[PDB]
């Protein structure tokens, strides 16, 4: 006789094999893939017009909503109705359903393609105890640059065309993570300030290289509502601006590298 044997050529391990596959596909299909749909769903079509009743598959693929109670008041429920209001200045290259769109105006200012920003809250991201998290050093006076690293305040910013475009006046720091996230710079010849994400910054000892945009393009970097704080949407607006430059700053950057 045999441990694990069952009637007529079955055995325990053979059953567990089937059980295990079932468990996996259950978690993957009925749980994980629905969690994946808590953003961006329901999908959009060349106008889905059935306004009276919903199509069955769009109800089945969604999970039951969940609510996050936010740390400084508020709740967010996902998934939810979140359509893109803004007029996108794009035009259809063709009639085909998955053909790309072309920008109609100036894609950096018009904030399309790689220059698009999410419609995040117009609120300032906060520290654990309520303060503005992302502030420049004029405000965050107990934060310093660390012993050994370039202090960029004073250094020039050189844009992609080798042209000095302004002077770094300040660094904005993340007070929750102790991490510098933007440099503030004066834009030469236009008497305004502008924020740059450090990820677009090549920090040298004598200058700050910025290859994402041209010197002239520092004029139209999105402006903040306030001098000394920034909202999550403004952070998106600012970061997206330079990313747009990677593809749009010159005509030649959109076309094939070879």
């Amino acid at each position: 006789m045999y441990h694990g044997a069952l009637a007529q050529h079955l055995d325990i391990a053979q059953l567990v094999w089937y059980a295990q596959w079932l468990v996996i596909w259950t978690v993957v299909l009925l749980y994980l893939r629905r969690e994946d749909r808590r953003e961006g769903y329901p999908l959009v079509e060349p106008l889905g017009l059935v306004k009276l009743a919903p199509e069955d598959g769009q109800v089945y693929e969604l999970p039951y909503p969940k609510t996050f109670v936010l740390p400084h008041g508020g709740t967010v429920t996902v998934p939810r109705r979140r359509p893109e209001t803004r007029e996108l200045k794009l035009a259809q290259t063709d009639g085909f359903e998955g053909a790309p769109l072309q920008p109609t105006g100036n894609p950096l200012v018009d904030a399309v393609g790689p220059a698009s920003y999410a419609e995040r809250a117009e609120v300032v991201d906060a520290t654990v105890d309520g303060k503005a998290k992302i502030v420049p050093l004029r405000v965050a006076t107990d934060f310093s640059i660390a012993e050994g690293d370039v202090d960029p305040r004073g250094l020039p910013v050189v844009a992609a065309d080798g042209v000095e475009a302004g002077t770094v006046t300040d660094l904005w720091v993340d007070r929750s993570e102790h991490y510098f996230r933007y440099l503030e710079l004066s834009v030469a010849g236009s008497a305004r300030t502008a924020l740059i994400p450090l990820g677009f910054c090549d920090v040298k000892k004598d200058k700050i290289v910025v290859t994402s945009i041209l010197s002239e393009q520092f004029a139209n970097v999105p402006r903040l509502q306030s001098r000394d704080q920034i909202t999550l949407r403004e952070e998106d607006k600012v970061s997206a601006y330079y990313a747009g430059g990677l593809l749009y700053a010159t005509p030649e950057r959109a076309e094939s590298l070879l």
């Binding site: 953003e39 999908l43 060349p46 893109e84 794009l90 290259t93 393609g113 654990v128 990313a243 959109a254």
Partner: protein, 273 residues
């Protein structure tokens, strides 16, 4: 067809070759020139799989095996039934993988994001080349490479290992295994941490970056921080193959004995022999 937030990103440009000609989607899939080459190579590949398999004994997916040639064919073409199919399929695989990677750079450029992902995808393509190309080059036959079968490829890993008596003692292997284990751990810790902060449950409120770092400081005295855990994760994963590659390439071309014996360099130092 489109995610609610998708349409604003779906713009033309960022290709590497072909400009507008292949710059479009099909359903959710971006195509590009490398989408086209990918599908080409995939089609060719799985065609050659299917032809080869029908000329074999069985159709049970577990027992199919397309194997490389005998060693006697060295680095030449082999008859199609006795290693040629395996040679053709390997080329189609490399075509598909490299296409897939280059497809990913194109998608990255269009979104104006980093190329970190196709970059990261190079290391498994590289490791595949270590096993199927470079190590067979150094030994001199394609027959040293591994067969394409669900279970038959394990029999090759098995015997390859035992050709060196105890592969566990391979120092490149020791390094590779250690990254495999700690990488799996860190992903648990990372994913666990993120969900624990956003999902305390019981109606309790969502926490904060400070809470993230406070937790790890408390339990192990250090927290590497939000951005860094992602850099470390990619580093840990990538070193599974980047270090293991050395242990694979060493075995045969630079070491013919058993791997335990290799540690003689330590054990047999005269000062304590």
């Amino acid at each position: 067809a489109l995610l609610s937030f998708e349409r604003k990103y779906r713009v033309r440009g960022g290709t590497l070759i072909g400009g507008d000609l292949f710059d479009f989607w099909v359903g959710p899939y971006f195509v590009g020139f490398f989408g086209v080459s990918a599908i080409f190579f995939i089609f060719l590949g799985v065609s050659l799989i299917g032809y080869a398999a029908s000329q074999g004994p069985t159709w049970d997916p577990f027992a199919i095996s397309i194997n490389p040639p005998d060693l006697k064919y060295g680095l030449g073409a082999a008859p199609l039934l006795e290693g040629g199919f395996w040679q053709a399929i390997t080329v189609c695989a490399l075509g598909a993988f490299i296409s897939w990677m280059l497809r990913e750079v194109e998608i990255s450029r269009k979104l104006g994001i980093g190329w970190h992902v196709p970059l990261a995808f190079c290391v498994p393509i590289f490791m595949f080349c270590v096993l199927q190309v470079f190590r067979p080059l150094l030994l001199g036959s394609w027959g040293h490479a591994f067969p394409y079968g669900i279970l038959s490829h394990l029999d090759w890993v098995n015997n390859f290992g035992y050709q060196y008596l105890n592969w566990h003692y391979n120092p490149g292997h020791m390094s590779s295994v250690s990254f495999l284990f700690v990488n799996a751990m860190a992903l648990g810790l990372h994913g666990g941490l993120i969900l624990s902060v956003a999902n305390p449950g019981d109606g309790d409120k969502v926490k904060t970056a400070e809470h993230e770092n406070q937790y790890f400081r408390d339990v192990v005295g250090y927290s590497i921080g939000a951005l860094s855990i992602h850099r470390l994760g990619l580093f840990l994963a990538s070193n599974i193959f980047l270090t293991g590659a050395f242990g694979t390439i060493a075995s045969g071309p630079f070491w013919t004995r058993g791997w335990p014996e290799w540690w003689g360099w330590w054990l047999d130092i005269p000062f304590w022999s």
